Amino acid sequence: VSQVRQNYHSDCEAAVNRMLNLELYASYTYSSMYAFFDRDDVALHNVAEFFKENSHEEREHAEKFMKYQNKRGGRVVLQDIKKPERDEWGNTLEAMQAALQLEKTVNQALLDLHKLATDKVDPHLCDFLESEYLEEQVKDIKRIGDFITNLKRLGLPENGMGEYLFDKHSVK
Amino acid sequence: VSQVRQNYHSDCEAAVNRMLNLELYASYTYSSMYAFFDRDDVALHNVAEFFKENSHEEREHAEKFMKYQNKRGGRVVLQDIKKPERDEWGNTLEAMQAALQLEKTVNQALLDLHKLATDKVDPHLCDFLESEYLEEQVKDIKRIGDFITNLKRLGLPENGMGEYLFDKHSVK
Amino acid sequence: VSQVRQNYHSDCEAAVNRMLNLELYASYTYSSMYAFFDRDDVALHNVAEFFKENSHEEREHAEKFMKYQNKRGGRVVLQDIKKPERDEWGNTLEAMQAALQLEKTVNQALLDLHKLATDKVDPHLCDFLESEYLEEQVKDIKRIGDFITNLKRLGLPENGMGEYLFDKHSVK
Amino acid sequence: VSQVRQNYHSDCEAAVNRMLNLELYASYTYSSMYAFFDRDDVALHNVAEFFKENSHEEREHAEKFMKYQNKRGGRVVLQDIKKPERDEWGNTLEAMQAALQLEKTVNQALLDLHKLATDKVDPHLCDFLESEYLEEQVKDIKRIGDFITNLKRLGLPENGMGEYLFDKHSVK
Ligand SMILES: [Cl-]
Ligand SMILES: [Cl-]
Ligand SMILES: [Cl-]
Ligand SMILES: [Cl-]
Ligand SMILES: [Cl-]
Ligand SMILES: [Cl-]
Ligand SMILES: [Cl-]
Ligand SMILES: [Cl-]
Ligand SMILES: [Cl-]
Ligand SMILES: [Cl-]
Ligand SMILES: [Cl-]
Ligand SMILES: [Cl-]
Ligand SMILES: [Cl-]
Ligand SMILES: [Cl-]
Ligand SMILES: [Cl-]
Ligand SMILES: [Cl-]
Ligand SMILES: [Cl-]
Ligand SMILES: [Cl-]
Ligand SMILES: [Cl-]
Ligand SMILES: [Cl-]
Ligand SMILES: [Cl-]
Ligand SMILES: [Cl-]
Ligand SMILES: [Cl-]
Ligand SMILES: [Cl-]
Ligand SMILES: [Cl-]
Ligand SMILES: [Fe+2]
Ligand SMILES: [Fe+2]
Ligand SMILES: [Fe+2]
Ligand SMILES: [Fe+2]
Ligand SMILES: [Fe+2]
Ligand SMILES: [Fe+2]
Ligand SMILES: [Fe+2]
Ligand SMILES: [Fe+2]
Ligand SMILES: [Fe+2]
Ligand SMILES: [Fe+2]
Ligand SMILES: [Fe+2]
Ligand SMILES: [Fe+2]
Ligand SMILES: [Fe+2]
Ligand SMILES: [Fe+2]
Ligand SMILES: [Fe+2]
Ligand SMILES: [Mg+2]
Ligand SMILES: [Mg+2]
Ligand SMILES: [Mg+2]
Ligand SMILES: [Mg+2]
Ligand SMILES: [Mg+2]
Ligand SMILES: [Mg+2]
Ligand SMILES: [Mg+2]
Ligand SMILES: [Mg+2]
Ligand SMILES: [Mg+2]
Ligand SMILES: [Mg+2]
Ligand SMILES: [Mg+2]
Ligand SMILES: [Mg+2]
Ligand SMILES: [Mg+2]
Ligand SMILES: [Mg+2]
Ligand SMILES: [Mg+2]
Ligand SMILES: [Mg+2]
Ligand SMILES: [Mg+2]
Ligand SMILES: [Mg+2]
Ligand SMILES: [Mg+2]
Ligand SMILES: [Mg+2]
Ligand SMILES: [Mg+2]
Ligand SMILES: [Mg+2]
Ligand SMILES: [Mg+2]
Ligand SMILES: [Mg+2]
């Protein structure tokens, strides 16, 4: 019964709320990675800042879904933001592997929401996902996979010199 | 039998002509609103200019469909532009309510055309509607709904001071 | 057993983690307020943006505690960020009243942490709280109290014109 | 019996003189490190310059205590500046480990002086230490610990390539 609401299915409204929870969850996981790489016994500042920037990106993605919900006449419903799966992230390779899996999880949720929007015949929601989320997801997954290939090349996890070189030349 | 025509169904060609008629109809309705708010016994110039700008926007939307028709090899067929439903628009709240309904009518026609384009497997027409029309429609509907909420807050229709304040602070 | 750790009590390390949880909780509450005032049936955009900016400020405060933890050789430990107390915030006056109470809650936690830092004879932590948190808290509480006084003056909650005027002249 | 003296305990005056001796001692130790890394058989110029800059910083810290002593009406009393503990510093890792211990020694003296100032109820001296010394100490200790973690990662002391890479990418 919002005066603006048109062609917006209740199931899509709910799925949008779940999606923005997941973006906040992803933001929090990257926050955790930032703090781990900033530890004095880890001390890879370029890596830390990479994850810090990703944390802000994911928060922005969540805010964009809140704005979207309101534009369509749906109602934002928030739930707890669950803490990350780990308290410590091992090393740059383990963290990047976790980041790749997180990005693929977020991507799968976006594709699932696109499929729901398709089934409910909601082209505005389809366009929004395609224009604002799906391409950035593919780019981010490609970036992280490329990093993982380089970290393996550099001899991670055992090769500390390799880890240092990555921090100084791949995320500088 | 246009040399450029490819994957363009006769039903979509006809629906595009009907859509650009409706954009011209919407333009004319907003023209009428501009003239009403410019009356010396109405005299809400910021509101009048808001509607005047919307009238030009809708005309541009019509022209874009004419260009689209030709790009696909369809043929522009014009029909009369029907005069607006009312000759006078009451006050800012009544006008905005009429504008909201008009915008939702235009939006429904765009969504119907997108569904036809989907059924005829015409991704160029789908993309055109998504990229050029559907998002602006959602933004415009949200803007007008927000205005209506504020006009009600301000005590319209009875509260003339409220109407004055809206003209001076919401469409300045 | 961090190599950098000096004069940093385990209880202060734990209290810093709890404090940065509370800053994230406060950020999330302000996010919720932003989304409520952006609703088409609420539509007070200046108020919404005020709360959105406060949400980002609180997130920055949390990040600063993460950096602080690491600088002292403590270890960041994250917990779930609990969803806000309410899903809808009534009106500008109710929201500002909730904001005042939230700010006083955060302030009390900061003062409690300062007292713990005092008891553990940790002048670096005392200075950090005084220089980076306690003054901004007093300023923010004063700002919100001033707003509440003005919203009451303007006749909230009943006086919708008053609410409109505040949005247009106090948070413009 | 200085005309300016107020609320300045004789024990704090004496402790300030001892503190500025220790800053000069720290300056001299870093001078020694600069000269060692500038040796033709050591030849790590970026590391050498890092230590040279730290030597000047510590001298400035000493001068600031002299100015402070006079501002409070105490009397500067100088003692010999003892030569550093070592004549040669092994390698970048050994030097950084010595630097970390020196920084923690200076920090402990500053915290001890803050405790004395607290016991003598001297808030001006407390503020001075907090504002001018204690935060820079925490930052410097964190910087050196981060370096040590990276030097170990790079395989020091055995890995000469690692040592070269640190000089070229961490203190450039
Ligand atoms: Cl609907
Ligand atoms: Cl529904
Ligand atoms: Cl929901
Ligand atoms: Cl759960
Ligand atoms: Cl873990
Ligand atoms: Cl995952
Ligand atoms: Cl065709
Ligand atoms: Cl056909
Ligand atoms: Cl036709
Ligand atoms: Cl007819
Ligand atoms: Cl009429
Ligand atoms: Cl209509
Ligand atoms: Cl006014
Ligand atoms: Cl400790
Ligand atoms: Cl402890
Ligand atoms: Cl904890
Ligand atoms: Cl709980
Ligand atoms: Cl509620
Ligand atoms: Cl509270
Ligand atoms: Cl005295
Ligand atoms: Cl004395
Ligand atoms: Cl002395
Ligand atoms: Cl001696
Ligand atoms: Cl020696
Ligand atoms: Cl030492
Ligand atoms: Fe995301
Ligand atoms: Fe991403
Ligand atoms: Fe990204
Ligand atoms: Fe239009
Ligand atoms: Fe429109
Ligand atoms: Fe528009
Ligand atoms: Fe005004
Ligand atoms: Fe805060
Ligand atoms: Fe103090
Ligand atoms: Fe201070
Ligand atoms: Fe605050
Ligand atoms: Fe603030
Ligand atoms: Fe110093
Ligand atoms: Fe220092
Ligand atoms: Fe320093
Ligand atoms: Mg309603
Ligand atoms: Mg529903
Ligand atoms: Mg979920
Ligand atoms: Mg749990
Ligand atoms: Mg794109
Ligand atoms: Mg690339
Ligand atoms: Mg021909
Ligand atoms: Mg035909
Ligand atoms: Mg028609
Ligand atoms: Mg007729
Ligand atoms: Mg678009
Ligand atoms: Mg707006
Ligand atoms: Mg250790
Ligand atoms: Mg502990
Ligand atoms: Mg708590
Ligand atoms: Mg709960
Ligand atoms: Mg201050
Ligand atoms: Mg003020
Ligand atoms: Mg005298
Ligand atoms: Mg004396
Ligand atoms: Mg001494
Ligand atoms: Mg001697
Ligand atoms: Mg300071
Ligand atoms: Mg650093």
From Swiss-Prot, chains A, B, C, D:
Name the record gives this protein: Ferritin, middle subunit
Keywords, in A-Z order: Iron, Iron storage, Metal-binding, Oxidoreductase
Family assignment from sequence similarity: Belongs to the ferritin family.
Function: Stores iron in a soluble, non-toxic, readily available form. Important for iron homeostasis. Has ferroxidase activity. Iron is taken up in the ferrous form and deposited as ferric hydroxides after oxidation.
Catalytic activity, reaction form: 4 Fe(2+) + O2 + 4 H(+) = 4 Fe(3+) + 2 H2O
Keyword check for Transmembrane helix: no
Annotated S-S bridges: none
Thylakoid found in the keyword field: no
Pfam families, A to Z: Ferritin (PF00210)
Enzyme class of the recorded protein, top EC level: oxidoreductase
GO biological process: one example: iron ion transport
GO CC terms of this entry: cytoplasm
